[PDB]
Amino acid sequence: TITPSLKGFFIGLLSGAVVLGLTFAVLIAISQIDKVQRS
Amino acid sequence: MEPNPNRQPVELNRTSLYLGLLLILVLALLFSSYFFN
């Protein structure tokens, strides 16, 4: 059974995955838009 | 036997001796009271 605290655990897991996910998505995006000039 | 080429000499200069003896003696002066309890 999914106790309230297991549901809580899942909520936390999702929240963390969302925060990290959006963070990496945004940083990758920005990195792609603002490339360093080489050569 | 053929000698080991990884060997290195070891050194402790006088200043390092003095520093080490100071560390050890002062540590001993500190902890001795607790060792005697």
Added chain:
Amino acid sequence: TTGERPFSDIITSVRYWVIHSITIPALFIAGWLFVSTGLAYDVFGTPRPDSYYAQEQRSIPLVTDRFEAKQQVETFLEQLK
């Protein structure tokens, strides 16, 4: 230098102050109203000066159970009539 606009340039410019004579006071006032309306108390659950004790009570509303702590707090708040 790292490529960003110098701070002294920015903060000695008219445009910065045009923006910020609006944005800074607005934020200050928003904080002020955050307190003066009492919203802070409600958001954070901080007792108002009249909400620490019931009239005749002198015992602290201390949380004493981990998993029913929420309910305990709610009961303490209810007992303020």
Added chain:
Amino acid sequence: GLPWYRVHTVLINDPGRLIAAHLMHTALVAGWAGSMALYELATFDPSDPVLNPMWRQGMFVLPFMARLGVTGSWSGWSITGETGIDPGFWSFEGVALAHIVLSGLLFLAACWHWVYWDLELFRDPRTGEPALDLPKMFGIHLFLAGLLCFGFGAFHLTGLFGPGMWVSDPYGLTGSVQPVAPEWGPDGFNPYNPGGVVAHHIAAGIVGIIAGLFHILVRPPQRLYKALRMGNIETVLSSSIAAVFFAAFVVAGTMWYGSATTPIELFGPTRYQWDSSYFQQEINRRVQASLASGATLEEAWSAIPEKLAFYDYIGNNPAKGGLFRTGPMNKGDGIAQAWKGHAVFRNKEGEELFVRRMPAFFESFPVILTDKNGVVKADIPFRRAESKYSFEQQGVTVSFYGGELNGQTFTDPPTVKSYARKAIFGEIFEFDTETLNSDGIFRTSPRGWFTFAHAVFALLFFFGHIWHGARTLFRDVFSGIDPELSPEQVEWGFYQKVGDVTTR
């Protein structure tokens, strides 16, 4: 030459002498285990598992031997209090001896590897230079570890081929070594469930086998090889040290909070069992069940096992010790001889009064007695001039139920006060303070000492980890930075990307 703190760096490019040094270290550790077991056997009194168990005697390795099924001595006794048992070879003595012999063999092997250090095996066939293929060594060793772990879980702990492990009731009254079946459901991750330990070793064992095979068979990505400097053994030192301080913090934690692998009959009770009056609650439950079934108070309390009463005493709380208060718990309060019985305090009106118990935090604590509702009814005053609650004013008496003092009542204020003073510690016991010249001051148990030592070593190993990680990742500059370092590499904005010359 080398500074003193670098003498061992001579082993870095010498796999054979490194192996020799590891052999010597292992020999030292195993020799330690043997000699420690021997000293404990030379000091351990097996005559009273109830009130003088190993954890009262400052026993450290003995509980670990007991934990995995070594419970008897060649001399005929067992730690569960049995007589005329034959433990076979693997008694405490046999374990100690085995470790001593192992120590000796490792010493000799160390000598061989030190002398014959220059083996072709340690040479890269392509360069003729000393080299160890660490990723593959990792695979081989991980595979071996996997096999050993699996086998430990599946055979030893299950009892399928082995003795099992120490298990007990929730109150540590009837502990013994038993085979334990794996728990494959979620309660397997309950630290207090032994089956979880067995299932752990079987499953993690298999996983270790598979990952080991993988590491034997699959080479590192060039990017990880370069990033982690996998040609440099010090990287292995760094990450191994990190893993080790992790494991040490974990065993410190499980020792302090308790788990299926840190049983109270082997290491002593936890501070938290005192904090929550765990044993007091169980004792009261049993007494109430006795009274409900028609027993007298005297009978109800007399039915309480001495071991359980003994757990309900702060002298066994491991958080009552001192860093420099050395030796066995027995050196402090004394060797426990017998339970005096449960003390019941009453005032002149006949209301039962309850002594307020000492929390672990307090080296000293006042003596305060309240009624069942926590109202103060009696105390031992500091200032007398305005005292209103003195035992003399309140006519406090104490009557004992169970134990040596069963059926007795004391009414003279000095004695009643004395027992109240002992009552702050919980259940009251008679001690032999003469045998060890006990000083009356509480010492911690092996639970406390193990926990202390391991939290400290773990924390220091955090530094070891940091240091060797640093040495690994910064090998190129540890004798110093480039003398030809250009000021433009550190002046801001010259490169768009810090440290990258291709971004001018």
Added chain:
Amino acid sequence: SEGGRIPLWIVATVAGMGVIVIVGLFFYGAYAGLGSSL
């Protein structure tokens, strides 16, 4: 828009006086209302 129009010494003097005013208010508040002990 143009950097330099409002002199930095004025910005510093005004900002500084603002800080003095707000901190001053906090100290007044130490003697009045909540936390005043009265």
Added chain:
Amino acid sequence: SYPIFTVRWVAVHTLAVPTIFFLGAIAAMQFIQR
């Protein structure tokens, strides 16, 4: 000649915006009577 919205700008405002809000709050607090 210069960008406006940079990493630095963001960092600065993550601190400065709440700071002014909070100072306004506490200022309001100085007039609260029991």
Added chain:
Amino acid sequence: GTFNFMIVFQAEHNILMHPFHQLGVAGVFGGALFCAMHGSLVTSSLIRETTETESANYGYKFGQEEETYNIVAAHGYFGRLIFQYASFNNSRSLHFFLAAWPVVGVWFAALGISTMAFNLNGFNFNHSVIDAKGNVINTWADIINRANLGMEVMHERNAHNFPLDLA
């Protein structure tokens, strides 16, 4: 005896709550921080003059004219750790700061002791917080106060005949 002096001082002046002592603490904590920091940055930017089988200290010879570390690299590091203008590129300014922070802080510690010598004591917020009825609402200052009380009542248990400890 030093500890006795400290505990009694806390009891009688609430020194922890005195800003000169807090400045003292900032002084010694800060002193240690900057000592370790400076140590670490200078050590971090030592110019390679030695091999791995010898101490890097031998890379410096007593009385040499050339500086033994690269301050530009040190500043390059620390300036990126925080931000450029929070880092010293001037060794003299840096060392002046290194001198001044602990010295000034410790001057304040000393003046703290020396002015509490005349019983101008730490901040007293005992019962500063009161609810609408007038109930006392404890803060951490009041718990401090309880500890201080324990100290006050127990120290020199035979020396006082009268209710106030006036010096």
Added chain:
Amino acid sequence: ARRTWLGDILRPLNSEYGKVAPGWGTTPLMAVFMGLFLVFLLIILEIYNSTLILDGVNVSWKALG
């Protein structure tokens, strides 16, 4: 260097110093296992801590009997 019987036997196991798989190789799979391991540790931690409470999982000395 000295050859020995056992050294000869073990030689292949220590002959691939420096040998790498191209580029990122199995790094992503590794990363997946790390994420899963992190989640596992998080689970057992929150269980021990009583933040995660599961049916039939009584984190106590009174776990059973």
Added chain:
Amino acid sequence: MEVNQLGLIATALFVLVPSVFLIILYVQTESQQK
């Protein structure tokens, strides 16, 4: 005073063992070729 009767040996070995280690290293350093 009722001190720990092992305090003496504990302190003595605590001082002597590392001190001796250091003296050994120093002296063998001095005797190396100049």
Added chain:
Amino acid sequence: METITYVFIFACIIALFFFAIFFREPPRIT
């Protein structure tokens, strides 16, 4: 015996001060 130990360690430390000062390795400009 405790007192003897303490005073002994102290005296060793003072003697150490003496050697560390008057019989230090001299600093030399290269």
Added chain:
Amino acid sequence: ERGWFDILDDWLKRDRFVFVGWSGILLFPCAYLALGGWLTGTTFVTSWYTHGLASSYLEGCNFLTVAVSTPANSMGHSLLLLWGPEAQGDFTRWCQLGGLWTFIALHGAFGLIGFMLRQFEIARLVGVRPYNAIAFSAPIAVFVSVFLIYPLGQSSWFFAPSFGVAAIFRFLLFFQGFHNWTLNPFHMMGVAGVLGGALLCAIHGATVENTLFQDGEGASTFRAFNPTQAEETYSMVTANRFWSQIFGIAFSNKRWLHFFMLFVPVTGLWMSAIGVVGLALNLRSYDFISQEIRAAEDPEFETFYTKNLLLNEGIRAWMAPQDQPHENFVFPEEVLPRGNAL
């Protein structure tokens, strides 16, 4: 190789006003949340339900007395996650249960991890040795031992330090009265390392500043230095003679001097961390047994040690009922330890 990872790496490691790095991804959110949480709590959040204390500007506290206080003792060592079984997603209740404490402690810890990783990353990019991070291991050892290990060894987070000025002072006085922490030789080594570090800082700064070479005409001597100059800005030789003649010994090696400046305070803090680890288990240096046996038999025998224990006993009895409200201590006037008159 020029995939997304390397492009991200490029952007992350761009030379900007505030360096980011891979470490920034851990550091900045965690540090921001730790600090923000502290400011938020100290401004608005009570400790009424956890401690029976006011702890915010909102309640009338000032900067010295505000805190984010530890959870109630009954919370034990709960992670106290917002979504956990205690708060159950309710932010207000979460604040009221002391959720901001664990919030701050944990984001704080990961933030410190992020900062030290930042030190390593930047050291690597600039090409310097990573001694700053290594030295930073001491602050971390302190934070971890005191804010995490200590309460973990005690009954609950309640007995950890609360994040507040006065609260921290309370933590100090608690450690005196209950642990006799001053008597602890690991704390003593901590003290020696801190005061010794401040001494080294002051003495080194002053020595450099007073052995400067005249490199300018200015009476204000700071401009007479150039970052890129090869020469030492001060005289090691003169400094060495000065201290040799003043104090008896002197540094002669600058590298040694500065390593020593690293070594002393870092080691001090680490020793203190070890001691606090002991205190987590109440494994204190509280007593000298010989002292107690003598004093027990001889009521004329008195040392500053016994006097200090009397002070400790006072602290405990007078502060415990309000400091530990979950124990429901009731100490009658008559049981309170007091000397004459006071």
Added chain:
Amino acid sequence: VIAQLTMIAMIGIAGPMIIFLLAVRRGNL
């Protein structure tokens, strides 16, 4: 209370006013 804040407002502004006026008029600062 209003009067006191008005007084410290004029007195408080006087100095910066001196400086401002001199800076505007290229005075001998």
